[PDB]
Amino acid sequence: FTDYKVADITLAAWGRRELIIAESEMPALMGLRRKYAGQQPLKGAKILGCIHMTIQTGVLIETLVALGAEVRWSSCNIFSTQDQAAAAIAAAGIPVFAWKGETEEEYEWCIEQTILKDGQPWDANMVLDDGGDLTEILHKKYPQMLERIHGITEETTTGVHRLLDMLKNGTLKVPAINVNDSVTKSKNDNKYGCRHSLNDAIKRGTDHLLSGKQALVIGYGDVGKGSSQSLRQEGMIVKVAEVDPICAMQACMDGFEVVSPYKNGINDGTEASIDAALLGKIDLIVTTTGNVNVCDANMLKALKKRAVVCNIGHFDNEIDTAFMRKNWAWEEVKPQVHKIHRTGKDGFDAHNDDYLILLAEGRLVNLGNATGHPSRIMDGSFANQVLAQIHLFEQKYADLPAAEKAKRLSVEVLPKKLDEEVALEMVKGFGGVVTQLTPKQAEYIGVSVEGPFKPDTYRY
Amino acid sequence: GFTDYKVADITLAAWGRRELIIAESEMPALMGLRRKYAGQQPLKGAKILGCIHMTIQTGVLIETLVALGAEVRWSSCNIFSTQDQAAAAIAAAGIPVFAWKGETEEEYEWCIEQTILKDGQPWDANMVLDDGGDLTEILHKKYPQMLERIHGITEETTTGVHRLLDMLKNGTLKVPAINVNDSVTKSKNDNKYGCRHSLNDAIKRGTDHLLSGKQALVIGYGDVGKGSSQSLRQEGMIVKVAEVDPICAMQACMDGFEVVSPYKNGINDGTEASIDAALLGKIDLIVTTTGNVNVCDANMLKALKKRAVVCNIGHFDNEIDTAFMRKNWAWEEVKPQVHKIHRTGKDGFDAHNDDYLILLAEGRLVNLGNATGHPSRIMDGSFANQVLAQIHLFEQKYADLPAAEKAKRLSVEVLPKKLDEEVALEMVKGFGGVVTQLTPKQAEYIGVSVEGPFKPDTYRY
Amino acid sequence: GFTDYKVADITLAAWGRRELIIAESEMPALMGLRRKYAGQQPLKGAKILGCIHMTIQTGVLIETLVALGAEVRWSSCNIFSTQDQAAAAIAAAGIPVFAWKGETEEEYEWCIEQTILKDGQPWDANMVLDDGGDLTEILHKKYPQMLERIHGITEETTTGVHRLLDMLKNGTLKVPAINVNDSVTKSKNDNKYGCRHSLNDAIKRGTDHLLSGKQALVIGYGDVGKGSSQSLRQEGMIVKVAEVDPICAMQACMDGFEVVSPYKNGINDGTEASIDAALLGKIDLIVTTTGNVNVCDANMLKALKKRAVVCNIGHFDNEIDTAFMRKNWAWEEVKPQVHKIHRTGKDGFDAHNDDYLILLAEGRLVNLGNATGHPSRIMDGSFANQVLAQIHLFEQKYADLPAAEKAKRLSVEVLPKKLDEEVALEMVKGFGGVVTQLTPKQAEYIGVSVEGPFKPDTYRY
Amino acid sequence: GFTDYKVADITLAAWGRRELIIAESEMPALMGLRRKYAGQQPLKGAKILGCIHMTIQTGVLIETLVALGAEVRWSSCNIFSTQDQAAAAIAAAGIPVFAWKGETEEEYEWCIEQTILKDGQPWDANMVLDDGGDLTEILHKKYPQMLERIHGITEETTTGVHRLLDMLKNGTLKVPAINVNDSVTKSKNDNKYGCRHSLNDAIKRGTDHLLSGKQALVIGYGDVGKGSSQSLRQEGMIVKVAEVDPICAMQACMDGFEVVSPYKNGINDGTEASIDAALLGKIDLIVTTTGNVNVCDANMLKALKKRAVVCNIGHFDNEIDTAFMRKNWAWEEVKPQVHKIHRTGKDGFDAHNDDYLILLAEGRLVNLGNATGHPSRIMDGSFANQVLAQIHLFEQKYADLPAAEKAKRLSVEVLPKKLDEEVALEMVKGFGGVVTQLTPKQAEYIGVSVEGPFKPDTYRY
Ligand SMILES: NC(=O)c1ccc[n+]([C@@H]2O[C@H](COP(=O)([O-])OP(=O)(O)OC[C@H]3O[C@@H](n4cnc5c(N)ncnc54)[C@H](O)[C@@H]3O)[C@@H](O)[C@H]2O)c1
Ligand SMILES: NC(=O)c1ccc[n+]([C@@H]2O[C@H](COP(=O)([O-])OP(=O)(O)OC[C@H]3O[C@@H](n4cnc5c(N)ncnc54)[C@H](O)[C@@H]3O)[C@@H](O)[C@H]2O)c1
Ligand SMILES: NC(=O)c1ccc[n+]([C@@H]2O[C@H](COP(=O)([O-])OP(=O)(O)OC[C@H]3O[C@@H](n4cnc5c(N)ncnc54)[C@H](O)[C@@H]3O)[C@@H](O)[C@H]2O)c1
Numbered sequence A: 001f002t003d004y005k006v007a008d009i010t011l012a013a014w015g016r017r018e019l020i021i022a023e024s025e026m027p028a029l030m031g032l033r034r035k036y037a038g039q040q041p042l043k044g045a046k047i048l049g050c051i052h053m054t055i056q057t058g059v060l061i062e063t064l065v066a067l068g069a070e071v072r073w074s075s076c077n078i079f080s081t082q083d084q085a086a087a088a089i090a091a092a093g094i095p096v097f098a099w100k101g102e103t104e105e106e107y108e109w110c111i112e113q114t115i116l117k118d119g120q121p122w123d124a125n126m127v128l129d130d131g132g133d134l135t136e137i138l139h140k141k142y143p144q145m146l147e148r149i150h151g152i153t154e155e156t157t158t159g160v161h162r163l164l165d166m167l168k169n170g171t172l173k174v175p176a177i178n179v180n181d182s183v184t185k186s187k188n189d190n191k192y193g194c195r196h197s198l199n200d201a202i203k204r205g206t207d208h209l210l211s212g213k214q215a216l217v218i219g220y221g222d223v224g225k226g227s228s229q230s231l232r233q234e235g236m237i238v239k240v241a242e243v244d245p246i247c248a249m250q251a252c253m254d255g256f257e258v259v260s261p262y263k264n265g266i267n268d269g270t271e272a273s274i275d276a277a278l279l280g281k282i283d284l285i286v287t288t289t290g291n292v293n294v295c296d297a298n299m300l301k302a303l304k305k306r307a308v309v310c311n312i313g314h315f316d317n318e319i320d321t322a323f324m325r326k327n328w329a330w331e332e333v334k335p336q337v338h339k340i341h342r343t344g345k346d347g348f349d350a351h352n353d354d355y356l357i358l359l360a361e362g363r364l365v366n367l368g369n370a371t372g373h374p375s376r377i378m379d380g381s382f383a384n385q386v387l388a389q390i391h392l393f394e395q396k397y398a399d400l401p402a403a404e405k406a407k408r409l410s411v412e413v414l415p416k417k418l419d420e421e422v423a424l425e426m427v428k429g430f431g432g433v434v435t436q437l438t439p440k441q442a443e444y445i446g447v448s449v450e451g452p453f454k455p456d457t458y459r460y
Numbered sequence B, C, D: 001g002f003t004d005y006k007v008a009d010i011t012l013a014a015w016g017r018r019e020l021i022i023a024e025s026e027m028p029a030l031m032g033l034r035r036k037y038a039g040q041q042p043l044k045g046a047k048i049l050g051c052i053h054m055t056i057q058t059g060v061l062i063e064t065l066v067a068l069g070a071e072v073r074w075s076s077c078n079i080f081s082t083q084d085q086a087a088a089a090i091a092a093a094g095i096p097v098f099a100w101k102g103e104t105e106e107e108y109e110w111c112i113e114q115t116i117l118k119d120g121q122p123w124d125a126n127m128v129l130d131d132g133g134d135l136t137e138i139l140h141k142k143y144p145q146m147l148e149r150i151h152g153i154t155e156e157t158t159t160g161v162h163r164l165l166d167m168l169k170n171g172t173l174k175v176p177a178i179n180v181n182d183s184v185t186k187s188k189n190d191n192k193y194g195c196r197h198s199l200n201d202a203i204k205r206g207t208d209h210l211l212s213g214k215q216a217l218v219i220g221y222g223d224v225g226k227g228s229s230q231s232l233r234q235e236g237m238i239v240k241v242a243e244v245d246p247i248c249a250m251q252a253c254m255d256g257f258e259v260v261s262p263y264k265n266g267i268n269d270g271t272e273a274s275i276d277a278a279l280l281g282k283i284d285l286i287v288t289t290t291g292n293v294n295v296c297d298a299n300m301l302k303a304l305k306k307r308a309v310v311c312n313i314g315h316f317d318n319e320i321d322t323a324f325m326r327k328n329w330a331w332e333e334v335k336p337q338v339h340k341i342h343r344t345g346k347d348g349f350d351a352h353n354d355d356y357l358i359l360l361a362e363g364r365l366v367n368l369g370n371a372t373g374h375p376s377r378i379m380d381g382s383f384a385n386q387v388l389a390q391i392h393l394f395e396q397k398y399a400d401l402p403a404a405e406k407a408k409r410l411s412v413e414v415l416p417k418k419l420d421e422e423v424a425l426e427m428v429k430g431f432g433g434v435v436t437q438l439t440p441k442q443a444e445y446i447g448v449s450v451e452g453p454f455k456p457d458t459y460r461y
């Protein structure tokens, strides 16, 4: 077997050992594997996958394969691959092109090596994406391939928003499932995953004590909520910034002071609007917004000396790293850990005190400087991925008549009943015992003993 | 002189007025509406039947409605939830109010009827504000001609919304309603953080029990169960959580709680044999938060650790089978809303008996029964939604609409997210928080307006 | 059939008795001593003068001393700390008690006097139980002859112990004393976890203010300061901590608190220019825990954010400059032990004035003044130490020793660690905790006895 | 041509140097000692044998000692605790260091011997810095002639101090020691908050296991047990605590933990029947923190839930019975310092077997074995104390004292509280904290100097 490219194939045995441990940590995913392997629901599926080549993604991959699918995989971030996971997947005869520390050119090359097999476009019929990079490339560069694709399953908030923008503009060519907005994903992965992995990545990158220090978390959505708890539980004094008054209300009630980097919250683009007093005492800033330029150049210039700067949103443009590359000198401490000396661009003093520490060059810090979310959390997200892949592959959109295609070209979430069945296996994984409603109680609240237990409007 | 009221002690009015004045400083969203709309008088001509806990916070809501032009007739929607100084102060302002702490069930119904009737005849009401649905059902069952002239209902709580939705699907709902509960600045503020503040508060006032190091079982992990669990966990309790919803059960696990069931394998077999006796024999405190019926049943009560505290913070008392305890066990009142239930017999009890439970508020909502309910600054969000919902439904004038137009608008709706966000902003400003304003380029990037709304309607927060 | 007492309402005794019977189930260490030493009567012939907050918890302490054979005459050592139902139950049991909630300063000294004097002349006391040193000082400075018949003092709190040490240092202490405070089951239980339970409790009862999301400044980070900061932080307050001890400030930093000073660079020069007005203008709640004087001074009170809550949980009310506020600002009683201090003037205030502070318990012990102080299961440790200390000093019979032997026994020391561990063990058993027993090899490996003590006297826990 | 070292990879020096420069900015108490004492050179002539984990933090400690005039020869005090980039950077600085991560027990003793001997002969050492007492015991048993010229030992950890105290009790300690551990800026900073930081850190790096919602059992609740419990509880683990000290068990209860014993009724009768298999069958993670022997025994290991993680964060690896697991069960290495222990037999195993345990760091110090131990800003307090202890003992010149003077100073003591406070102050300033300065009236009121010390030696913090 040669249809792969990993950093070191001899890491396969290590990756296999961690895959075997991960299976015991992913009961909802392994429950689907045991339940569906006999009937082979993904028989005939050819899946283009673009998501962080981690140990957890390895278990997702082998689950899709155990259900009958062929895949060609790549990481959808340059720093997120676990090399031992990529090696184990390649050793199993699965086409994978990913390694930790890719260049932007090597990143595009890897996605092309999944799209292309033997120099010709692969005959793919399913897509699994994280952030929308593979989705955008197929729509703009290989639009003829989409004629044979039955659907897309998107992992993350940012990718879903891109899918919704294409649907609003009528440029989306195949239906998609919003995996992100399953509650066993958004309210599990996005929140508790970053709760687990944010302080994890900061410790591995810097070994900085967090207790007693001042943090500023930009954003208080699901990632911002989990990030803020990751820092607060370590004893940081966490301040939260937000543009959504509702999310800001939650930060207040959760015990956080809500502040803005700009005086009165108004960013007029000038340095005079920067709350220099506030930023001058922040030891750590974390961007969680999915927005652009939320930690801008003027904020970076006003930050306290030796503050840590990192992004746990999907894309690195949350921080203005381009400004830091152009104006400041970078000193690599170790991979994915850079000191940014604000003394100038041409040369730094090794003992300079006026620097910032940038993690993962602005990319997702939890995956860049650690291993991202743990297996038992990703279990929920990737069980939804398997269910979403099974659903769309069964619908066979690309083979339907155009009259039927237009009727089901949309971006849907999985039904709540499946969301609950994923949650149940997760709860059993903790040893939790859910109570069974009596018929009288189920009638009293208007639900089935079997569920679903909440209306679609319920926010949990 | 004004006599159209009934309260426990009118001489408490001065004390009530002082606390109302403090509460105004704690409710900036509510007082912001009072300042924005005072000149317009958007509720001029509104006659509001109100049934909601007669607390200091409800007083600020009442006086905001009156300040916007409305007349009201008020009662409490629980027998133990009235703050008597709040009721007295409202009555002293010439506002008809019929509420006192410690009503009998007979007096409870009388009080709601005193709002419905004025001088022995149906009041010329045209708006309804309800908490739990008791006033809504009485109008639908007993005064249907009054509902013809009523423009809408603004319902406060989850249980009342469910009753409204059941009436809607049955075609028995006569006027449209606004689901006030499902505003984020209500459900994810009041239900959760309000119970976080007030649950351990009520337990301390009632029992003065140390909570740290003791075992708690919280039945339910919805918004009330989440806040209730945090209320006990932050005090140092070892909290276990029961749930029928595996998604909520998943959140409990991730939040750091062991998820257990009072029944072996979660299955009630209709006998004591299915009770997890080892589990319940270690529980010092059980709190029901489900809005469901009989989630702390007789067989659970029998198996509870001696001297365990039993209370409910859902809307109705039937979460606990107190009827069983009235029928079978001897009650000893320690103080108002605090009873020792001796499991040794029905007739009497040894004064030093050790085999008793401590029931709070006789099973009624414990935060309002044994304390004062949610704090003003939290109720500010709920009651700002209530005022906005009263304005919107009153301006719609459903009662004046033709039959064909009424049918297009008979529904149970929530307020639009933009109003939910504007309520949250005033709450945030009350904390001194500074919301960031998006740049035009940032607003374009994430596809929203600079002024909001900032999330799609599907967003769960 | 008894008249040798003075309480607020004797008809409250039945209520107090019901709460005493509950508290007995919450105090296993104390009741454990009552069961153990019952038939032995180790306090036979003891006549104890007691000055400590007349709460339910002190009731079980008093009745334990009586059950061990002692006679007592009791007063409260704070004007606002008595639970009137507790004092009534103690009076109804035939024990002289002079205490009620809301004493004046002169009424306070009268009550201590009524325990010192029985039927016009000094009682033949031989033991002293004190909390703060007020009873101790009155005996030394106003009744020195009675100290010739007293076998010792058992002091409850940190401030009283400090006062005992200066007397020992200056050679004015006439009878030996036991530092009850510095037992670990006291200081590291009572002072810390008691205030954790009862601080937010008292603030809630007095004001019903939401704490989450607001700004608190805790002056001091000793045992009381540590528990107070947690009491507020666990409710979601943003807590800043002031300290003069860098080691305690270090703990505050590591515990997750920003360490600040009300004075610029920590230097108080008495001028308003030294006040960090930007800092104090953001504080919604200030809590003094120092045991020091004037740690929340006049300039801090002037610079505090409008409508901030000001309270004190250290033993003496002079931590806050309430004298300045009485002299310059107008006091509005919201309810007992809750006052609004209007900074707009002295001789009047607008009923709707916004520039006021809220002072709890008039600067006295806020947890005891506005709530019920520490819960029974926490006070169980402190008062089990008090009983053991009373037993030890009474058996020593200091006043009966020759002057040579007295000089060798005149000191202020703590109970042995072994007793500290035996109290702790009963508390752990009360929680259902199971302590592990060392094997013979393990005890030898770490060089301790299987029964204990398990730590050297230098261990800090 | 410096060759007097042995590290894993000298080319890691540049990376280790970069992290040392970062660490200097995180250790203001250590760097404050450098600036204050550099010109004075208080350690000129000192030749320090050092045995403590060769981390980046130790590198800053080493270079502070050298900056003050000391020469050192260094080894790590654990086979897994070295950071090879730290060891490489120290050797590149021309400092003799013999340490690498993953030594065999033979290489461990060889490394210590390489510091003791220079060019095959005893080095002219005169000071000892030790962590655990391994270097101390080797000198007392094998090189007593070197001890004659050594002025003192400065011991880092609780276990080492206990060994020193045993030698002092038995009259076998040959040089005086400073108990660095029992500084408050060590014991109550390093032992507690360091393990808080690094325990979950090590478990995450070794296993990447989610901790939220899982069951943990912490054996011991001293300072390391307190910090380990918080490390897990803050992640959302359900933490149960075991203890033989009832006072520490009391703190665990009050801190919100259930206190359990691995043995029925806490009595280990040796037999397999005394194991609480029901409890251990639910534990996902067990952490030993006792400094004792065999607190996680073979029967506990046989009863642990499948796939449970087993680790130790006490100083020595014999807290867990790893020798039993080597004799009976198959070890599968996942990766360095992570082993699956298959309970299905000693010879071989199935690659898909589910009956295994995960042992971290082969039972050695898990925080240093699987991560990097405590962060710089925490080690700053410990190592500022180490430097101060070295200066104090070196200036005393015990080895030069006559026999009569040596006898009056042969002891194991702690640094004076004033130095403890001055370390804490610099730590507090490192966080940006502002300590308040007492006014002369306040300092007189509580009886302390404005400069400190602010607490008596009995104070436990
Ligand atoms: N690294 C990970 O493991 C991980 C996991 C899930 C999602 N993500 C990514 O993280 C990002 C956030 O996802 P989410 O689920 O939290 O989305 P979300 O919609 O729940 O939260 C984003 C929040 O950012 C706020 N925000 C936007 N612009 C802002 C600004 N200028 N200043 C302050 N706040 C601002 C919004 O108000 C919103 O509340 C996305 O890009 C998503 O793909 C990363
Ligand atoms: N007292 C207060 O201050 C206050 C405040 C808000 C709401 N409420 C009341 O509290 C109740 C709950 O409100 P909510 O907003 O939390 O509703 P919710 O729907 O969000 O939560 C109810 C939860 O109970 C669970 N549940 C149902 N039956 C159960 C059973 N047998 N065992 C265990 N769990 C079970 C459901 O799965 C659900 O998650 C309602 O009656 C509401 O009116 C009271
Ligand atoms: N209300 C209660 O229930 C209760 C319980 C126990 C003790 N107390 C009282 O509380 C007080 C404190 O007791 P403790 O045991 O915590 O004492 P402590 O000695 O342990 O701590 C007091 C702290 O105050 C600090 N401090 C002193 N002056 C200061 C100043 N000007 N600014 C800032 N910090 C300052 C000291 O540095 C010290 O750390 C005593 O008076 C004690 O009697 C009250």
Ligand SMILES: NC(=O)c1ccc[n+]([C@@H]2O[C@H](COP(=O)([O-])OP(=O)(O)OC[C@H]3O[C@@H](n4cnc5c(N)ncnc54)[C@H](O)[C@@H]3O)[C@@H](O)[C@H]2O)c1
Pocket (backbone or CB within 6 Å): C436, C438, C442, C454, D157, D158, D159, D160, D190, D191, D194, D195, D219, D220, D221, D222, D223, D224, D225, D242, D243, D244, D245, D248, D289, D290, D291, D292, D295, D313, D314, D315, D316, D365, D366, D367, D368, D373, D374
């Ligand atoms: N890894 C690190 O970074 C680090 C840091 C400091 C100390 N340590 C080591 O950790 C150990 C503990 O140190 P410490 O400062 O916490 O000491 P400590 O004396 O404060 O605590 C040890 C505790 O273990 C308890 N214990 C003893 N035997 C027990 C048993 N069989 N079951 C349950 N509990 C038992 C004791 O009662 C005591 O409270 C020492 O060996 C010390 O050298 C490690």
Ligand SMILES: Nc1ncnc2c1ncn2[C@@H]1O[C@H](CO)[C@@H](O)[C@H]1O
Pocket (backbone or CB within 6 Å): B052, B053, B055, B056, B057, B058, B131, B132, B156, B157, B158, B190, B194, B315, B365, B368, B372, B373, B374, B375, B379, B382
């Ligand atoms: N202090 C209070 N005043 C008025 N209503 C309250 C108070 N506390 C809780 N409630 C409301 O009571 C309802 C439960 O009956 C909840 O929906 C909640 O909004």
Ligand SMILES: [Br-]
Pocket (backbone or CB within 6 Å): A438, A439, A440, A441
């Ligand atoms: Br049924």
Ligand SMILES: [K+]
Pocket (backbone or CB within 6 Å): A054, A056, A371, A372, A373, A374, A375, D208
């Ligand atoms: K991972």
Ligand SMILES: [K+]
Pocket (backbone or CB within 6 Å): B055, B057, B372, B373, B374, B375, B376, C208
């Ligand atoms: K209230």
Ligand SMILES: [K+]
Pocket (backbone or CB within 6 Å): B208, C055, C057, C372, C373, C374, C375, C376
């Ligand atoms: K009490």
Ligand SMILES: [K+]
Pocket (backbone or CB within 6 Å): A207, D055, D057, D372, D373, D374, D375, D376
């Ligand atoms: K480290």
